[PDB]
Ligand binder design. Structure first.
Ligand SMILES: CCc1c(-c2nc3ccc(N4CCOCC4)cc3[nH]2)[nH]c(C)c1C(C)=O
Length: 125
């Protein structure tokens, strides 16, 4: 069964915009989004549709690029490290749930390298 998706806005959580958060949305997220391997990561894992009944029995901190995008659009993060942490959570969840050699893991690995490539240099303040 599917849990509620991660929140994308919270009235108790303070919002912020930085030059690095604008970078992560405009170039990092939006370039990754257009990659040929992006499609499995553009929305939360639908355990019912994908016939993965154990996915949320294993993954207790789910994360996907659609949630990250909405969070960036809503100024949900305080800084860039908070957003990068969500990207790393998405990738690690995929390696936790699946095994080396799986097609999904090969796709995740390709996207992680491109992500690291792009966050290697970020803008300044
Ligand atoms: C292999 C199952 C899996 C997916 C995934 N399988 C998908 C199949 C179809 C779609 N579609 C979405 C809407 O457009 C039409 C096609 C999205 C999918 N995402 N993602 C992740 C992170 C995993 C893991 C780690 O097990």
């Amino acid at each position: 069964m599917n849990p509620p998706p991660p929140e994308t806005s919270n009235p108790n959580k303070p919002k912020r915009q930085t030059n690095q958060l604008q970078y992560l949305l405009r170039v990092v997220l939006k370039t990754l989004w257009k990659h040929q391997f992006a499609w499995p990561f553009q929305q939360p894992v639908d355990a019912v549709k994908l016939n993965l009944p154990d996915y949320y029995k294993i993954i207790k901190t789910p994360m996907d690029m659609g949630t990250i995008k909405k969070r960036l659009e809503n100024n949900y993060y305080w800084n860039a490290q908070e957003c990068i942490q969500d990207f790393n959570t998405m990738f690690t969840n995929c390696y936790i749930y699946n095994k080396p050699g799986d097609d999904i893991v090969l796709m995740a690995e390709a996207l992680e390298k491109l992500f690291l490539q792009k966050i290697n240099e970020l803008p300044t303040e």
